[PDB]
Amino acid sequence: TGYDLSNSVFSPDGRNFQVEYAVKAVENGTTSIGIKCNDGVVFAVEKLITSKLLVPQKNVKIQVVDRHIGCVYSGLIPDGRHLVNRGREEAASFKKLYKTPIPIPAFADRLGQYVQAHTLYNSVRPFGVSTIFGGVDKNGAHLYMLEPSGSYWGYKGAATGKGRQSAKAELEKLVDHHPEGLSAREAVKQAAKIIYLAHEDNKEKDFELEISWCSLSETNGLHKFVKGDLLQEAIDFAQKEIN
Amino acid sequence: GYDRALSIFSPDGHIFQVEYALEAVKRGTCAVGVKGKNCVVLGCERRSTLKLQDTRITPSKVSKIDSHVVLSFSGLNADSRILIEKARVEAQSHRLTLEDPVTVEYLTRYVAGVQQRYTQSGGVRPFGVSTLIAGFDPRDDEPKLYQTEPSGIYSSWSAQTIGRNSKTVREFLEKNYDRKEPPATVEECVKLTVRSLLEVVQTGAKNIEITVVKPDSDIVALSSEEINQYVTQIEQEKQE
Amino acid sequence: NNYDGDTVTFSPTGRLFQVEYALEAIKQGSVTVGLRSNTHAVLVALKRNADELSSYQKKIIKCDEHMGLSLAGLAPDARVLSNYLRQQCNYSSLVFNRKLAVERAGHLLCDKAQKNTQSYGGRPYGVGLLIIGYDKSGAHLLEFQPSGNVTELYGTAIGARSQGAKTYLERTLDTFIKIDGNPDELIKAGVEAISQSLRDESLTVDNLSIAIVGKDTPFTIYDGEAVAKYI
Amino acid sequence: GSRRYDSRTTIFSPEGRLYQVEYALESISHAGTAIGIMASDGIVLAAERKVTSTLLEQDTSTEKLYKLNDKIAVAVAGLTADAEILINTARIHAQNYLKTYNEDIPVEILVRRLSDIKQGYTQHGGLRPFGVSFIYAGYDDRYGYQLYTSNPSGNYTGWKAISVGANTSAAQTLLQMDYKDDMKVDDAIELALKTLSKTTDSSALTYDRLEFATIRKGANDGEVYQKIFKPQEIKDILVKTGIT
Amino acid sequence: MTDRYSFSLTTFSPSGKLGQIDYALTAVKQGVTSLGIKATNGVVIATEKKSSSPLAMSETLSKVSLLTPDIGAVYSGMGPDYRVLVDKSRKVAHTSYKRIYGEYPPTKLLVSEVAKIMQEATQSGGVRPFGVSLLIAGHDEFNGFSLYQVDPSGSYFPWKATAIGKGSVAAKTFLEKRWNDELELEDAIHIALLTLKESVEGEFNGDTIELAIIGDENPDLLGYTGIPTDKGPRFRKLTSQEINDRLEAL
Amino acid sequence: TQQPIVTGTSVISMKYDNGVIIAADNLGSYGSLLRFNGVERLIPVGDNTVVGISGDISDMQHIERLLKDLVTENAYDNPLADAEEALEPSYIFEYLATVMYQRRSKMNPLWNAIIVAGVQSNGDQFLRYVNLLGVTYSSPTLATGFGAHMANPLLRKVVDRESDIPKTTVQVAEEAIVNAMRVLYYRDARSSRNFSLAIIDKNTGLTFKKNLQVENMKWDFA
Amino acid sequence: QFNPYGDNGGTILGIAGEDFAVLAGDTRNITDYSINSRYEPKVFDCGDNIVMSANGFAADGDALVKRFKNSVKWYHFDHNDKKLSINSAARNIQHLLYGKRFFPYYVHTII
Amino acid sequence: DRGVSTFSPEGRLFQVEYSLEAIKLGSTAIGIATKEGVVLGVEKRATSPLLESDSIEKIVEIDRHIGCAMSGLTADARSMIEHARTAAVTHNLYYDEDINVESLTQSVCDLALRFGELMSRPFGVALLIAGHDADDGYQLFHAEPSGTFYRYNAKAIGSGSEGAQAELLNEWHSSLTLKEAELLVLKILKQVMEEKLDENNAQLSCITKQDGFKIYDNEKTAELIKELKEKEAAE
Amino acid sequence: GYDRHITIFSPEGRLYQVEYAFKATNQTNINSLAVRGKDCTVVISQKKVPDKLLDPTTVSYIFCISRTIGMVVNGPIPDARNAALRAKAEAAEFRYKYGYDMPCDVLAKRMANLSQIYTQRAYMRPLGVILTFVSVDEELGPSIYKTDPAGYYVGYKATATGPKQQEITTNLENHFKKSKIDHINEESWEKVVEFAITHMIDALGTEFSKNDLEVGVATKDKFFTLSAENIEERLVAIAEQ
């Protein structure tokens, strides 16, 4: 054997064990989700409060690309930042040449090809993050999830991290109960509930909730963070449902 | 470009590639340098498993770096050519910029620096060569003899030997060389050099080379008969 | 075991052992403490010597008039990273006439450390850093780890026996955060914090190192007889 | 990374030997024997082709003996493909010297440079050495007729008579026995063939398994001629000495 | 990133073998049989078209390839390796010869250039040797007709006739009995078809056999008229129908 | 080395007690041909800065894209992008000044004369000039091209030194700017009647006025 | 053809006493026959009790002052907050200027 | 094998730790700092009696105000000295002044970690850098291949270092004269050296504000050796 | 045994990394099929969407390389998209350089050459994909050309790829034995699609809904994919016969 010691080596199965090992690092990370809605997308993430000494609201994990795309990820946080930095470069050169802001499917493949490139050589390590991202473009709303292998698909709802199965189950119920569609303001509230429900798989340390959203009507097609009254309202909704 | 760090430290603090290069020097034919009151003599062993040789055209063991400095060596022959070439080029470059030929110390310091560079550069192995560099500084009559080795260290010697069985000939020189009174003449210096090689060589026929360097670019190589006379004289005094 | 030969290799459980071994170098380092109020931010560092004949290794480095850090681990790596911060702070001033935000400083350090954990040939940085600063949004304290992870805090500590000071600050949180407009008292709290990490040794005059930055105070370092006030 | 798969071709053994050079010489020892003999009025180059097939085109073939310029030739022992790389480099080097100085290149200078190239592959670059040993046969107005040999280590030496490839130990003993200094070319031709005939691994030495060449001053007055022997000419010289 | 493999992947073993070259020759042994026969007025090269699937169109896969108007090539071993070698061989005939001398290279020299390329894959950093043996047939004014074999090592040999691949040992013995120095081109084609039938197992017709010749100039295949000195290519690929005509009088 | 093709003429500006005013006409000239009439040469950055540009229009559009990109880049990983860490006029200017001087030093300039007008976070008025040579300067009144020769004299009668700034209201200041634009239409052969005007006040913020016209002109003495 | 230089006018003056030194300069800035600013300072405090002015082409003048101010900053970082003496500053400024020998800073500098 | 820039599980760089073992095999070098000057002394250690000991150059000038002693793979020190000299002279060219001893040491130590897969391995030599400047006065630094440097009142490096350092711990005080320091280096060298100490197998040097860096003659050191033996017999 | 980790020869003359890349081809557990009509070339592939949270419209293994060329992939999606982007770039460059649309077979050869390089050069791994290119070429007419990780390529009368490829292959073989021709003798592409689905149903032994399939069609001057309703319309036609 020894097939798992080097990146880009096929095992006799036809598998790249190094990528599968990077997935284990993602599974170890905190929970993050994405919900597609009527005219946009909503992102949410679990922030473990390791200590009283952490300044609340001041270790922001959700990241914006361009002015219309949001990105969140679980796993190795630095690896995620590297991917977003590339995403920002990709989006900038697209807008430079073609004038229009980068479409979400176009942006999704830019990240996909870049992550896939890190499975082609033994001189690089695969990414230790699964990234949930999306936004609003000329063709409407799009939600995507990208994995260490470079694999990505479009999603109605997406989840990754330690509480992914709990969050996936809760997401599937929303898809079944709302065939016509979910509103942006509703999706924010649901996002809070699902993070709180997914926190049961990480319940030693208590946590801090963080939400963001893009909506054609509510945010005018731009990425914004949910703060203040709208955040507390979403927290209270989640608190009422666990009890 | 090929980048691999071939020369590296081991747990005990040794650089094995440099030390194994010293083993290549130990395998090489013996070379000896002895400096007198007014001269330096470089003696060299030539192995006799090679008959049917052409000695006219076969590369000589002692090489002129400039008209006033010479270089002999022990170890890998192919490696030595690279050091000799670089030294010869630096000799002409020094004359061009300083308007004065190199000192023996300077030429030695350069060659030693080249050897050192190959011990901490990527993609290269050390030189499997130790050198004896001898000559006279410009407008100076004090004899100079220096030694270098694969690691890059260099130093001055009253008399020194390198190569196979060099520990035997070094033993000989240590009791037969007086610091207070070095070989006063050319004859005395050549004889002590030939004597020291006869402890190790075999026959004094076409196995020993001798080169004498005197002040002001006066370098000459001895022929077979000239060397054979020293061999004949030493053996007759020995039977006593 | 078989997966710790280089940084480019994941373990079967998804760990990067070279990054973890770099993290271990920080734990061996001498203790240093960081804490802040709303007006000032303070670094306190225990310096370490080779023996009684030697000097005490300097732990604190200035990056700009409004920013600087303390180090624990490989000191040369702290010199490389602090130099990078000096350049980034400086680029911000020359090009934009703008003092670099302490948060951006953290983001830049994170991304620089990350690149060394995903490529063949290189190695992770072997040092942890506590960055303090005062910018347009007040006082700040950051904790840098060579894994790439940067974290903003009210107070913290890194190095050997840093858990003692970290627990103390966790208890004292409500007190020291409201030490506004009083430098000497905020330092006293930091000196008392680092004292919870001492064993057999106590704070002497050429052992202690303090730094402070704030509203009307440039980043300045105190050593020697200037810290005798706080023992 | 890629460190895992590096053979480290340019390192020393604990005994101070170069692994890859030693193993390249082991390869060369299985190649067809090539002999060079230097006489007072010329040089002979003789070489044995590697086990021939009857359907091999013999006349339009070149395996062992190559021309470097009008005054210098080489006999090859080892990988032919490796040798042709080095031969083309040597051919170019000779033309560079002629272009620079308006004089044909001295034999040793060409030999040294080709040997220096081989040396480089043993000290740096991490590549395998050339699995080739040459016998150089040439003439210039400084030293006259000269024989040299070079091997993968990049070390070269001069000879009166020498063999490379297979059975060199046995071949060298036979040459050392019958060679003398006042020898002529026609005598050297006979010695070369007689030596191959006794050291060969084949049943009997025939014209189709040999390449032959001479470098004489047997042109008209004070000039050198290279003669690469044709098949029929080897057949005749083999009868003339009574081997067949 | 970047190619960190700057070192040789083919090295000498203690016994003196070059492992990767030997293993490349083993891959050639597994390959389908191909052969070449030289006549007085031409050369023939032939091979079996091993179809991967009956749904596959074996016409689209050409094992016998034109390199120059007077030079052709066939192989045994790994097909993809052969395909890129033909691309490189065609280009080098232009860049290192035709663009300099205004004429096509003689067979021996083009062979020499291909051999160089295959030698470099044996010594350069981070590459394996080519897993093919080539048979190159061609004609040029001053050397006439010629046939060459090129091996993974980069070595090449001129042949009167030979075979490579699966059943080369038996095929070579067959050719030794039949070959003489007075063979006319048609006689050489006949012997090529006889020799190939021994190694082929399944169907034996013009659709499963690929065969080309180097012979007389073909003015009809030139594509233009008006220049007397230009008389057309000597390389011609025999059609499926032309092969079957000769299989009746077999 | 360049030559300007499509060009914009004067940009004029001044400080008043609570902020700054800046104006420029809507013309894109092609030599003597008055080719394009819908050209906006005042470009706002945030709600606290307006950059007025004269000279080559292709280079102006390039600078637009840079400023647009600067806003995007400043928002990245910046929770206070619309508060304490928002782009200041001084930041925007220094960036442009750096670019202009770098381009002149590479002998490939952006063929422009630029005035950055705005209000800082502490309420202070910001008004500074930079051009193709990388030359920078500040004054209570600033103007480019013909504006320098004809507008500045008129605007300096209102605010002649620093102490005149608190004594100057927004009504008085705008009146002087609008008058100056009329004078430029009389006398500059590459001016248009249509123009844009922007006020950046420390209390009322950014007011951007489009499609203004020069009016109350005297010709009857002809 | 593009001309990378301009003339911003103005004049400067430095006098040294026994225990003091002055560096004066007018505040007018011009191009051709127009005034750009009536108050645009070109004499600067560069730290370590060194005052500097680079008069001529203002863009080059500002660039030089900016680079020297930065040189003082890094001198502190690299040499343990040591004070930059006026003689050392002068030598440093020579290297700044001569570094652009073949595309000069168009200024007369006084410190 | 394994990477050159690899960390051990204990958080140390293998190659740096291994180079420290090479330095322990090196010949002894001692330095003592006083208010009257800094003294540098080394063990020459000739491998054979035929070797001319005065050609052994283990104490070296960097500038007039900075000197240097070495221990370990001494060939590796040549490029370090070359860099130090260039750095010292270059700073004088750029700033018309002497460069601080600490700044020089930092410049040399920047080379240390510039190895990996830059040079192929760390340096196998430790340096004692001694000098004087107007700001911090007389200084002694110990520069390692780790890129770290400590200031010392006194320091020993090489094979006899741990024994010599313990001796320097007892003997050093803040009021030592230059003469007292000279004798102290000779005393401690004689204790840890294999062969018997004399003027040919040991070398002294110092740096003072007034006269700068000076390597002592064999005649001058011989008298200090004689002065040392007499004083130890006198009680 | 490091000869199994990189693309160098094993003692028996094999490249294990290439062989293991072939096994990655079936990792998706999807079967594809391609046939030719008179005027068209049809390609069909299974569409499996297991997760309910997925957006089914974004799940695809068929790609529009150029206006005339389409490509279906058998293998993991990251490698599939890698191949697609390169093919698109190559086809675009060809048109720009040579003034006419890149033929299907020429693109197949080019992508096969790239794949060959990965089998010879060490630092690049093979892509674990099999690429089936389809078009109606302006010279050669309806065309199917297929590429694999070994760098092999060939034209096809028809073809199939996937875990149950052999069953589909023989099914098609037996039809062309019967029909005695090289293609589907049919006028409209609609009925050629119907043939493709019918013979896949017979070979695999499964029924298909509208969301279980994915269809690509190549005609003269355009290649296009079918919607769920286009396929449903096609499924209804088969059922009513």
Ligand SMILES: [Cl-]
């Ligand atoms: Cl290609």
